[PDB]
Design a protein around this ligand. Structure first.
Ligand SMILES: [Ca+2]
Length: 153
């Protein structure tokens, strides 16, 4: 379900963080587990209703012209905690102010390990930092793999 010309951005030099780590167990549910390439490890946290906020953030080492992103199920608990809706903010390189993407992104029921793709239109040039504020579910949520995409040559 991935647009043909999207290229996943290499994540190994990303610096990632999140609002909270479920059970304060960083090794088991920490932010970095969302970008390790493995469906069976996941970021997982309290939703906005409990903890007041719910988000995952990455500082990119190489800024990109962002064409979209993708998320999978979380694999910590039942599918009723998979991400349902989110809002995105980015910060462009050299800027101290953040820009909000003005559309709520909504996801359907995930199928196995398959990601769902959310387009960023038009692509946003020079994204240095990316945050996803998870709106629902508001009790608990997370995701096992997130990727950001840029246009291939
Ligand atoms: Ca993972």
């Amino acid at each position: 379900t991935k647009p043909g010309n999207w290229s996943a951005v290499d994540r190994s030099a990303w610096s990632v963080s999140c609002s909270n780590v479920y059970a304060d167990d960083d090794a088991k549910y920490g932010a970095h587990l969302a970008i390790d390439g493995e469906i069976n490890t996941t970021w997982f946290t309290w939703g906005v209703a409990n903890a007041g906020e719910c988000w995952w953030n990455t500082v990119l080492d190489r800024p990109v012209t962002l064409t979209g992103f993708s998320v999978t199920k979380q694999s910590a608990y039942g599918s009723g905690y998979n991400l349902r809706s989110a809002e995105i903010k980015v910060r462009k390189e050299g800027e101290t102010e953040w820009v909000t993407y003005p559309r709520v992104l909504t996801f359907r029921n995930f199928k196995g390990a398959d990601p769902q793709y959310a387009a960023i239109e038009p692509p946003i040039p020079n994204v240095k930092e990316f945050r996803i504020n998870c709106l629902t579910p508001d009790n608990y949520t997370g995701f096992a793999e997130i990727n950001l995409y840029e246009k291939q040559l």
